[PDB]
Structure formats: C-alpha cells, structure tokens
Amino acid sequence: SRVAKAPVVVPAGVDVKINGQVITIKGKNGELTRTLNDAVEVKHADNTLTFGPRDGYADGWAQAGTARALLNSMVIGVTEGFTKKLQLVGVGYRAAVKGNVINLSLGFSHPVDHQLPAGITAECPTQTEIVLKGADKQVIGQVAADLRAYRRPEPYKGKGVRYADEVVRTKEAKKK
Amino acid sequence: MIQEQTMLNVADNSGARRVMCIKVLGGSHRRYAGVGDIIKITIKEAIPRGKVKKGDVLKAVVVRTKKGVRRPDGSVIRFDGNACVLLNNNSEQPIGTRIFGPVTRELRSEKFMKIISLAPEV
Amino acid sequence: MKVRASVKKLCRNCKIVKRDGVIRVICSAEPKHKQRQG
Amino acid sequence: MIGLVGKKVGMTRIFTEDGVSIPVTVIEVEANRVTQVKDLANDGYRAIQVTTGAKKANRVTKPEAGHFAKAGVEAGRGLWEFRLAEGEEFTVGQSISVELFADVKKVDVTGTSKGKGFAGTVKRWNFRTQDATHGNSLSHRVPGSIGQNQTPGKVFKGKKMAGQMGNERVTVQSLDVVRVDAERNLLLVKGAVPGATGSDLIVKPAVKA
RNA sequence: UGCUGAAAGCAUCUAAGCACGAAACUUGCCCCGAGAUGAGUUCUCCCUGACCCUUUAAGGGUCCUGAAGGAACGUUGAAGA
RNA sequence: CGAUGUCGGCUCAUCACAUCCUGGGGCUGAAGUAGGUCCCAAGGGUAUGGCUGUUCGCCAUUUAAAGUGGUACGCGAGCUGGGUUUAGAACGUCGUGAGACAGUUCGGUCCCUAUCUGCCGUGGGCGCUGGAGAACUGAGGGGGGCUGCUCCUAGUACGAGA
RNA sequence: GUGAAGAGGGAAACAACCCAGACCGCCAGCUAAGGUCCCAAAGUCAUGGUUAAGUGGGAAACGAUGUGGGAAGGCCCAGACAGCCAGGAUGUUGGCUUAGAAGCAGCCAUCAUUUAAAGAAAGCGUAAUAGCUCACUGGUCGAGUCGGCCUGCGCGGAAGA
Numbered sequence: 001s002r003v004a005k006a007p008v009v010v011p012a013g014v015d016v017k018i019n020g021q022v023i024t025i026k027g028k029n030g031e032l033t034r035t036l037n038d039a040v041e042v043k044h045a046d047n048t049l050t051f052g053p054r055d056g057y058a059d060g061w062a063q064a065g066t067a068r069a070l071l072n073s074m075v076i077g078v079t080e081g082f083t084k085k086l087q088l089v090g091v092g093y094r095a096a097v098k099g100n101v102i103n104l105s106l107g108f109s110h111p112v113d114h115q116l117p118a119g120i121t122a123e124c125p126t127q128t129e130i131v132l133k134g135a136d137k138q139v140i141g142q143v144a145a146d147l148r149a150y151r152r153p154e155p156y157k158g159k160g161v162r163y164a165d166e167v168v169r170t171k172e173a174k175k176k
Numbered sequence: 177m178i179q180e181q182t183m184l185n186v187a188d189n190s191g192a193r194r195v196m197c198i199k200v201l202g203g204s205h206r207r208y209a210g211v212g213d214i215i216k217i218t219i220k221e222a223i224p225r226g227k228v229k230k231g232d233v234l235k236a237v238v239v240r241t242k243k244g245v246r247r248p249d250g251s252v253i254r255f256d257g258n259a260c261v262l263l264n265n266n267s268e269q270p271i272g273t274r275i276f277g278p279v280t281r282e283l284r285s286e287k288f289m290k291i292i293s294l295a296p297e298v
Numbered sequence: 299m300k301v302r303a304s305v306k307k308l309c310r311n312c313k314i315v316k317r318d319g320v321i322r323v324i325c326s327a328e329p330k331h332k333q334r335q336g
Numbered sequence: 337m338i339g340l341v342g343k344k345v346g347m348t349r350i351f352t353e354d355g356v357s358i359p360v361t362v363i364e365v366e367a368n369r370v371t372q373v374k375d376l377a378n379d380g381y382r383a384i385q386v387t388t389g390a391k392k393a394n395r396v397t398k399p400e401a402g403h404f405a406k407a408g409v410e411a412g413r414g415l416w417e418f419r420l421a422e423g424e425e426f427t428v429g430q431s432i433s434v435e436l437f438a439d440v441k442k443v444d445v446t447g448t449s450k451g452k453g454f455a456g457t458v459k460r461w462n463f464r465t466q467d468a469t470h471g472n473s474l475s476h477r478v479p480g481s482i483g484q485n486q487t488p489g490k491v492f493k494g495k496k497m498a499g500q501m502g503n504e505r506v507t508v509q510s511l512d513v514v515r516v517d518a519e520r521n522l523l524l525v526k527g528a529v530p531g532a533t534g535s536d537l538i539v540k541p542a543v544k545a
Numbered sequence: 546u547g548c549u550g551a552a553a554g555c556a557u558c559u560a561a562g563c564a565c566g567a568a569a570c571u572u573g574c575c576c577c578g579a580g581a582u583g584a585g586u587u588c589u590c591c592c593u594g595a596c597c598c599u600u601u602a603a604g605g606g607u608c609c610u611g612a613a614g615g616a617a618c619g620u621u622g623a624a625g626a
Numbered sequence: 627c628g629a630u631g632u633c634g635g636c637u638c639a640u641c642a643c644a645u646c647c648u649g650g651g652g653c654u655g656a657a658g659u660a661g662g663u664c665c666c667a668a669g670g671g672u673a674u675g676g677c678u679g680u681u682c683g684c685c686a687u688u689u690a691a692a693g694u695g696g697u698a699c700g701c702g703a704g705c706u707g708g709g710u711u712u713a714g715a716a717c718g719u720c721g722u723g724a725g726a727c728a729g730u731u732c733g734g735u736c737c738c739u740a741u742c743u744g745c746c747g748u749g750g751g752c753g754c755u756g757g758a759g760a761a762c763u764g765a766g767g768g769g770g771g772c773u774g775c776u777c778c779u780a781g782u783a784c785g786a787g788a
Numbered sequence: 789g790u791g792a793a794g795a796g797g798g799a800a801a802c803a804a805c806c807c808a809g810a811c812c813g814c815c816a817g818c819u820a821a822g823g824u825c826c827c828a829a830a831g832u833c834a835u836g837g838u839u840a841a842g843u844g845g846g847a848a849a850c851g852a853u854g855u856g857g858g859a860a861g862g863c864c865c866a867g868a869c870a871g872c873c874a875g876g877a878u879g880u881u882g883g884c885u886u887a888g889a890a891g892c893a894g895c896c897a898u899c900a901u902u903u904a905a906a907g908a909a910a911g912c913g914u915a916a917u918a919g920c921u922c923a924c925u926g927g928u929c930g931a932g933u934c935g936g937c938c939u940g941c942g943c944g945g946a947a948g949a
Contacts, residue, residue, distance in 0.1 A: 066551050109779040142548045168326045250357030304851035317558050379587050381762050399760045402589040472705050481745050484639050485701050498746050
C-alpha cells in the first residue's frame, strides 16, 4: 500500500468519463479511448481518481496500484504524450506512411507493408525517424517492438529498427 | 535406354565406328538419354587415320535411336540403330566433317547456340 | 548452450530472468553464455 | 455466374507451321434453362438448378422432378443442383445459351468416373504383385488384407486395402479453349478430357489463374 | 519473440491484462460418410373401412375397398463374381 | 520337455528418439559464400550395385540427402528356405577309437481341404413411433507435404579483391 | 509368527500383512481393524494447524528474492532496504618478475589528502586521454530490510519403447 490510495490529480480539461467498471479518456493530445477492469472498484471526482477493493475478491490494494499505473499513463498520453525515441538504421533503409500503413525498405524482396492497430498512428519527420502517436502506453511499445523484430540487428551488422539508446554489443574482428 | 559402360555407334567421319559411353549427364536424377541429349565418351582403339587419339575423352550428342523424336512434328520420328555425333570436349561443334543422315530440328535446344551453322535439319 | 541441472548465480553482469520454465542469463561480458537453468 | 452441360464428341487436329498438329477435343453443349433458385426459405442450403437433362420417362425418377418450376416438365439424364455461394441471382427464370459463352477463353470442366477392371488393390493403387518363378504357389495376385501382428490387441488399417473405385466426380480447374460455334453448340478444348465418345460433361468459365 | 506492470516503491514475457509464433494441429478444396441408435435437417409423395371375437388405453378374424411404394419377367448393359 | 518353426531375404503395419536434407532461432578462435556447432521440433523426404546366407566393415557410383532403436530378437496357416545343431560325404588334421572340428566345404524335402472372431466387398434384416421416394449438414475417414538449377531480389549486403 | 491344511470383516486384482476366528436358525442386535464427497453404506462434520503446487497422486543430487510458528545477529526512525538526484578527484608513474599492467594473465605488498564527497581496490573502457556501473558519501520519500538458524510446508531439477 504505497500508491494504491494516491489520487492522481488530473489537470483542467481532463474529465475521465466513468460508467461503473468502464473508464473513458480524451484530451488535447489524444482521441477517445476506453478501458475496462473486473478486479478493483474505481470511484472518481472533479480531479481525484480513486481505486480500491471488491467484495468476495482478495488482496485488492495490490492490484489497485497496477490499475492506477496504466490509467495515469493515459492522462499524460492525452495531454502531452511521450518524446520521440524510435529510429531506422541501414544503407538504403527508409520509412514512409500512408494512412494506417508504414512502407519500409529493409533489404528484402518485399517492402514489409506494416499495418497499425486501432488508436495508433505513425509519422516520419525524416526517412530514418519514426514517431508513434496514440493514448495507451502499451500500443506504442508493442508496435515499436514489432518494428524492432524485423530481422533484428545481427552481430556484425547492427542494422534495422533501433531505439535512441545504445546497447553494449559491437564487434570489430577478425577477417579471414 | 542408352547405357553406361556400353558401346555407342558414330554418325560422323574420322571419329572411329564404336565408342564407349561412361556418363549420360542430363536432367534431374536421370539414368537414361534420348535424341538431342549429351553423353560423355571415352576412346581406346581410336583408328589413327582419323582425327581422334588413343586413350582420350569426348563429348557427344545423340542423333539416332529407335524411340526417336516424339513431340515437335505432329508425328513420331524414328531412326535406325543407336548413334551419336562427336563434338569438341571444350570448344564445342563437330570434330568430323561428314554427319550421316538429315538429323532433326529437336536439337535446337538451350544447350546449343552455334549448331544452327551446320548443313543438316539443325 | 549447455542445459545443466541446477545452477547457482554469482555475477553482477548477468541480469538473469526466468520465463516458461527456462532461465536467460543476459550477459554482456560473454553474450555466448546461454545455459537454460537457474 | 454461367455454366453449361454437353457430351464428348471426339478428337480433331488444328495444325501449325511449327510441324505440330495439336490434339483438340470436341464437345457439343446444350442451352441452360436456369428455371429456379433454392434460397434460405427453410434450412441454410443455397443452390441453383440448371436441369437441362431431358429423357423420355416410363421410368425416370419422381422426386428429382417433384418440385419443377412453372414450365414444361423435362426430367432425367441431368439435374446438376450442386451448391451456390455469393450468387445474388433472380429466384425464378435466369436462362442462358451459347452466345453468352462464345467469348470465354478458359474453362473449368467436370465429369464422372467408372471402375478400372476389378479395382481391388492392383488397379486401385497401381501396386506390384508377388512373383511365381522358383517359388510361391497360389499366392501371386491374391488381394490381401490389413494383416498385422497381435501384440496390441486392436486392428490397424494403415495398409492401403482392397475395394471399389470410380462411381464419383472428377474435375479440371483450367483448360484452354480453341474453337467455338454458337450455331452448332460446339466447344473445342485444348488437348484431352476424361472418358470416351458420348460421355456426359459439365463446363463453365474458369475461376483459377 | 514480445508489450505494459505488481508480488520485490527497482527490475520482471504473469500476478490482473493485451499482441504475436511451425513445415505440424483445427480447417480450405476433392472423394467417402447419419448403423453419427448422439437416431440431426429438408424437399417430395400417398392411404379417411364395417362387423364380430378375446378383458383390452391392446390384439385376433372375415369380408369391403385400395394408395405412395415394393416384388419381378428376359431383351440385356461400361451394373458386371 | 504332455511339441513356442529359429537367423538372412521378398512383402507390410505400429510406437519412439539426444537428427542424415528439410522447419523455427542462436554461437564461434563467424566479415561475406559454404561446411561446422548448439536448442526446440520426429510433420515432410528416407539410394543402389559389389564381397556374404546376412550384418559389421570394406568397395563402386549417384544425391537436396543417403539417421536409428523398440514391437514374441515385429509378421514362415502371405512367400522363400541360403545361415544354423542329430540323413549323407569329402579335403585336411588329430586320438588307442566309435569319430571330432568357427577347420572348411557340398548337401540334408518348414507343412496346411480356414470351423469361429477380425478385414474387404456385397446381399438380407431391424430401431428411429403412419408408411415410402430423394437430398442437405458433417461426428469421422482418405488426399495434403520433400528438393536442385535458373530468372527476380542483386553482382545489392560483406569483402583490396577473389 | 503366518499361510501351508481357515469361512467372515479390511487392503484395486498379489497364500503371507491387520482385525477376529467360521455347529445351525431368526420379519433381531453390538462392536473390532477399517471407513464415512461421487462411484460404494456412514461427516462434502465440528475444531485447531500448515501448505497455493493445482499439489498430494513415483524419485536422488541440487539450485532459486514461494510461506506460517519460534529464537537471535547486521542496519534503523535526522531515519534503514529498494529508488531518483549528485560525485566518479589529488599526493601516485603500483612495488616484485618481465614479455607484460592505468588494482584487474604470475607474485603481494601498504599510507594519507582536498572535501559537503569519491577504493594502491570491485569490474570495465583504451593507444592513452575521455568515460561508465559500483564501493564510499551527501540530498530526499518513509518501516521494516538483509543473510543465516530451529521447527514444518511449496517449486522444478526429471530422456524411449
């Protein structure tokens, strides 16, 4: 019990429209998103959002912290979002976006042809930069990890979709 | 049909009269050959008044078989015996100068681009 | 790989995890360490 | 969608300057009545009746003509109800003939098979039979059975076993068209088709590439 | 392979919860198949008797009148033992 | 012991595994092309001739590729009857000797008028609640399927370069 | 001892093992070992304790932040653990051997400072410099946290017909 009673305190214009178990959210940076849970009971006021136990179910304050976490990650989503961190690396490798589909040249005999889930969009401010925009913290991290999954870096190559965070694996040997 | 370690008849001059077959080459896992297939040959007696030597290896093309040519002319085209024409084992084209009979336009296959310069049906 | 039987840990560089009955050691000193047990 | 029925008439040659004479099979077709559709009124099945078969009755089955449309009754030698999918047709009267078909380039062809002699195992599966030279009495071509050692107490039918063949449908997902006459109802197709002269066939425009 | 996140204020491919993944599996399409007694579902067709006897919410008999269906002849078949 | 035809071959099923090419992914004292080496995966593919009665093994020649065990040492009322251990005989050795012998070799007749269960085909009966004619659905079964080269990816990735 | 050469009751089918001994009968009747959710007659009993594997219902060695009872140690309420912010410097060129050492392939010594504060050692990054994560220490949230012991209980570890 460290944050499961902590009231979140949302900014002005964040209204969090609630119907029993159903909680919906919208704001100046995020289009209408729906959430649903059966493990913990949620009550809301003008700006203070409050989770807690259910009758007949056990240890509810240990789930209320998790239920608070994923919802407060949408409060920031619909107001300011997250900073850009996803990039593309490799010779001739480039991205473009048309509606819900990303066209990606990755040294393959097809252009990957990647489609987005619901409540997520993509932008490339340069041919090597990828900006994923939604309201759920999960969908952006799932699609980033699915873009990451194409070929993966390879130990002497280091090429594909990567983060703005250096990983401590690099080879420089040996030549036959 | 067409066997290894078995003699084959010659259909051109100065290349002896019977020559030994060692490999039937050709298509995927194939243990036989027919008209226009290529064969690996070895010569032991040579007949030294021709153009071939004793103890040497050659490349040949099948020109006569009893089964003959099956598709391109709307009728089967059969020939007499079981016979081949000898070719240069590197530089291609015939080593003799008097090919017997008309031969056939079924020899105009992807394995031959210069054969069209010869005076038979090819 | 090596499959081992029951393995003790003693290295700060291994950020070890467990999933679906198998252990991943997640090394950056020798990334070829891959034994499925711990 | 369209489809017709006909018979195998025989073999012809179209000729070329490339020396090939090219085998081409002749079929004569009949016009299709397309009298009525069965469409979801009771039970989930959908079907369109082409009928077209007409045989002198004496004889000839009753219920396979027991729900004929408000037209002159012609039954026997064909019904061809099959199955319908995503066709959104007229429920009554959508008749067709060969002037709707003469522009077709490739067809899908169906017919029925007959037995290969005794069938059994040899002509059923193309198997080899045991030899009779310097061995074997009365045990050369006998059809055999699903024999296996009893150590498991149950039988296993994994060996391909004796029985009957044919009496079923056979089909072609694409065949090229060669020659057409929409006055003689002739459709000439590239190469060969099942059966011999006078055998019944079903033909429609191809949907496979 | 993964996402997000508690137990363990970190971290975590599992706890609550969400996305993937094999040539195989369930399936596509072709054939056989409801003896599938778990007896499914549908289209079609047809018969509108009296009196008597045996304790019988069921049978037995004699005539009256007869339907869908069935039996089956020898010409016989690519149905073929 | 008051009777279990044993090993090799021809013929055909059933189960499994720490895998020969194929699936999905990593490692190298892996730059790339390839072989190699590990994990899950046993669904698909699964060489013949030569010496032998066979195998092991050696040998020959192919190929993408030439994996294996268990089952009454899997199946002799399907077939075969060479191996081996009771007819017989010979070359040779050895014993005082009937003879002995993986010391060889040549041979030595393993068979059958399917009762009854199963399987295949094919007739006949019967419960589905008045009786018949014909279809639709699909519990369930069978089929699926492995591979070189070559065009395209691209002489791109990697590499003086090959 | 038991069967051998013993009926019944119990025990998956397994002479022996555990109850108790088998003259005959009844519109009867009590307990023994054993059992009492279904299947199979009697508690899905009352109460107390522990375990969460879906265990127990095959298993050795062994490893890992699964869990009650009991007794103690280290740290701890200007304050612990985890975390985030901030440091990552100097005396000093680390002595011996040497090809070879900025602690970090062999050997093993040995003291301090600037300071709110930072190691002749913990582990890397190199040609060095840089720099990075910790030790140590400061700021800050705020109660148990660590590693073992006794008595009990989970998890896998664990391949063939």
